[PDB]
Short mmCIF file of all heavy atoms in Angstrom, two decimals:
data_model
loop_
_atom_site.label_atom_id
_atom_site.label_comp_id
_atom_site.label_asym_id
_atom_site.label_seq_id
_atom_site.Cartn_x
_atom_site.Cartn_y
_atom_site.Cartn_z
N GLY A 216 96.90 104.00 100.62
CA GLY A 216 96.40 103.79 99.22
C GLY A 216 97.23 104.06 98.07
O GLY A 216 97.35 103.12 97.18
N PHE A 217 97.98 105.10 98.07
CA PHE A 217 98.89 105.33 96.89
C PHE A 217 100.10 104.54 96.94
O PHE A 217 100.78 104.40 95.82
CB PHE A 217 99.10 106.85 96.73
CG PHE A 217 97.93 107.63 96.28
CD1 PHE A 217 97.78 108.94 96.77
CD2 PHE A 217 96.99 107.04 95.40
CE1 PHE A 217 96.56 109.58 96.41
CE2 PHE A 217 95.79 107.86 94.99
CZ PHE A 217 95.73 109.05 95.58
N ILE A 218 100.46 103.88 98.08
CA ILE A 218 101.61 103.09 98.15
C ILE A 218 101.13 101.71 97.46
O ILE A 218 101.88 101.08 96.60
CB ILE A 218 102.08 102.86 99.58
CG1 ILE A 218 102.55 104.01 100.40
CG2 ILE A 218 103.31 101.72 99.64
CD1 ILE A 218 104.02 104.38 100.02
N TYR A 219 99.98 101.31 97.91
CA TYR A 219 99.37 100.07 97.53
C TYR A 219 99.22 100.11 95.94
O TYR A 219 99.85 99.15 95.28
CB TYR A 219 98.01 99.97 98.15
CG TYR A 219 97.24 98.71 97.77
CD1 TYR A 219 97.56 97.44 98.36
CD2 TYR A 219 96.14 98.69 96.89
CE1 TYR A 219 96.91 96.28 98.02
CE2 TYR A 219 95.49 97.55 96.54
CZ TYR A 219 95.88 96.34 97.12
OH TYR A 219 95.26 95.23 96.78
N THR A 220 98.56 101.11 95.33
CA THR A 220 98.34 101.23 93.88
C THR A 220 99.62 101.26 93.15
O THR A 220 99.73 100.72 92.05
CB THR A 220 97.50 102.42 93.66
OG1 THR A 220 98.09 103.53 94.05
CG2 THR A 220 96.09 102.28 94.24
N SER A 221 100.60 101.94 93.62
CA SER A 221 101.98 101.96 92.91
C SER A 221 102.49 100.54 92.83
O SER A 221 103.06 100.22 91.77
CB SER A 221 103.01 102.91 93.78
OG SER A 221 102.46 104.21 93.68
N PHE A 222 102.31 99.78 93.93
CA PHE A 222 102.86 98.45 93.92
C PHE A 222 102.09 97.58 92.92
O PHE A 222 102.62 97.02 92.01
CB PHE A 222 102.54 97.74 95.38
CG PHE A 222 103.31 96.54 95.50
CD1 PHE A 222 104.55 96.35 95.93
CD2 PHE A 222 102.70 95.25 95.01
CE1 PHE A 222 105.22 95.12 96.17
CE2 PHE A 222 103.20 94.03 95.17
CZ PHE A 222 104.53 93.97 95.74
N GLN A 223 100.71 97.60 93.07
CA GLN A 223 99.88 96.83 92.09
C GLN A 223 100.02 97.07 90.63
O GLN A 223 100.22 96.18 89.87
CB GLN A 223 98.32 96.91 92.64
CG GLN A 223 98.05 96.46 94.00
CD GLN A 223 98.35 95.04 94.22
OE1 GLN A 223 98.78 94.25 93.34
NE2 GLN A 223 98.03 94.56 95.45
N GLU A 224 100.23 98.35 90.37
CA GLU A 224 100.36 98.73 88.94
C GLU A 224 101.66 98.12 88.38
O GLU A 224 101.65 97.63 87.23
CB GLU A 224 100.49 100.24 88.81
CG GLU A 224 99.11 100.96 89.05
CD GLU A 224 98.20 100.74 87.86
OE1 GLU A 224 98.47 99.97 86.81
OE2 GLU A 224 96.95 101.24 87.97
N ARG A 225 102.80 98.15 89.16
CA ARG A 225 103.97 97.53 88.70
C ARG A 225 103.74 95.95 88.59
O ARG A 225 104.35 95.28 87.74
CB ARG A 225 105.17 97.94 89.66
CG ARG A 225 106.44 97.19 89.32
CD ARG A 225 107.67 98.02 89.77
NE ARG A 225 108.30 98.70 88.59
CZ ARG A 225 109.34 98.44 88.09
NH1 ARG A 225 110.16 97.37 88.65
NH2 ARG A 225 109.85 98.96 86.91
N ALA A 226 103.01 95.52 89.53
CA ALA A 226 102.74 94.03 89.58
C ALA A 226 102.04 93.57 88.30
O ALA A 226 102.48 92.67 87.64
CB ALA A 226 101.96 93.64 90.77
N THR A 227 101.10 94.25 87.94
CA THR A 227 100.30 93.99 86.61
C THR A 227 101.12 94.26 85.47
O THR A 227 101.03 93.56 84.44
CB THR A 227 99.00 94.78 86.61
OG1 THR A 227 99.31 96.23 86.45
CG2 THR A 227 98.12 94.51 87.74
N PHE A 228 102.01 95.31 85.47
CA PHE A 228 102.79 95.65 84.43
C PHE A 228 103.67 94.50 84.05
O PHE A 228 104.14 94.14 82.98
CB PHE A 228 103.69 96.87 84.72
CG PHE A 228 104.85 97.12 83.83
CD1 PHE A 228 104.64 97.47 82.55
CD2 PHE A 228 106.17 96.98 84.33
CE1 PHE A 228 105.86 97.52 81.66
CE2 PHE A 228 107.20 97.04 83.55
CZ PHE A 228 107.10 97.43 82.18
N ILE A 229 104.28 93.76 85.13
CA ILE A 229 105.11 92.63 85.16
C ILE A 229 104.36 91.39 84.64
O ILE A 229 104.71 90.79 83.57
CB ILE A 229 105.70 92.38 86.46
CG1 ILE A 229 106.71 93.48 86.84
CG2 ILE A 229 106.35 90.96 86.51
CD1 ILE A 229 107.22 93.47 88.28
N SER A 230 103.24 91.02 85.26
CA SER A 230 102.45 89.94 84.82
C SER A 230 102.07 90.05 83.29
O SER A 230 102.41 89.06 82.53
CB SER A 230 101.24 89.83 85.63
OG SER A 230 101.47 89.59 87.05
N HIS A 231 101.48 91.18 82.91
CA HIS A 231 101.09 91.35 81.46
C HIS A 231 102.25 91.34 80.60
O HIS A 231 102.11 91.01 79.48
CB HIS A 231 100.22 92.60 81.40
CG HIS A 231 98.86 92.55 81.91
ND1 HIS A 231 98.13 91.44 81.74
CD2 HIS A 231 98.28 93.45 82.77
CE1 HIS A 231 96.93 91.61 82.35
NE2 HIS A 231 96.92 92.81 82.95
N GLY A 232 103.40 91.91 81.05
CA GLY A 232 104.58 91.93 80.26
C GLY A 232 105.20 90.57 79.96
O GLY A 232 105.65 90.32 78.88
N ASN A 233 105.09 89.70 80.98
CA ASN A 233 105.65 88.42 80.95
C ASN A 233 104.74 87.56 80.02
O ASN A 233 105.37 86.81 79.12
CB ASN A 233 105.87 87.72 82.32
CG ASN A 233 107.16 88.15 82.95
OD1 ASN A 233 108.24 88.34 82.43
ND2 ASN A 233 106.97 88.56 84.24
N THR A 234 103.50 87.60 80.21
CA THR A 234 102.57 86.81 79.38
C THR A 234 102.75 87.18 77.92
O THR A 234 102.83 86.42 77.09
CB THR A 234 101.09 87.06 79.76
OG1 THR A 234 100.72 88.37 79.78
CG2 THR A 234 100.85 86.44 81.23
N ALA A 235 103.09 88.51 77.75
CA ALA A 235 103.24 89.02 76.38
C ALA A 235 104.53 88.44 75.83
O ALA A 235 104.37 87.89 74.78
CB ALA A 235 103.43 90.62 76.56
N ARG A 236 105.57 88.42 76.61
CA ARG A 236 106.85 87.75 76.12
C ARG A 236 106.62 86.26 75.84
O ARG A 236 107.30 85.78 74.86
CB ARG A 236 107.86 88.05 77.20
CG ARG A 236 109.35 87.46 76.91
CD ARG A 236 109.69 86.30 77.90
NE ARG A 236 109.99 86.86 79.19
CZ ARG A 236 109.76 86.28 80.37
NH1 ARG A 236 109.12 85.10 80.36
NH2 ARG A 236 110.20 86.78 81.47
N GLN A 237 106.05 85.54 76.59
CA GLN A 237 105.74 84.18 76.49
C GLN A 237 104.93 83.90 75.34
O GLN A 237 105.17 83.02 74.48
CB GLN A 237 105.24 83.49 77.79
CG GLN A 237 106.24 83.41 78.83
CD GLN A 237 105.82 82.52 79.92
OE1 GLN A 237 104.70 81.86 79.86
NE2 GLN A 237 106.49 82.30 81.04
N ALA A 238 103.75 84.63 75.33
CA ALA A 238 102.68 84.42 74.21
C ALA A 238 103.43 84.65 72.77
O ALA A 238 103.05 83.90 71.84
CB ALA A 238 101.68 85.54 74.31
#
Side-chain angles (χ1 to χ4, degrees):
Chain A
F217 292 143
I218 295 278
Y219 183 75
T220 59
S221 293
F222 188 98
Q223 300 296 3
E224 288 289 357
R225 172 153 259 249
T227 62
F228 163 67
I229 291 167
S230 298
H231 288 314
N233 281 318
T234 54
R236 179 244 287 144
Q237 290 195 2

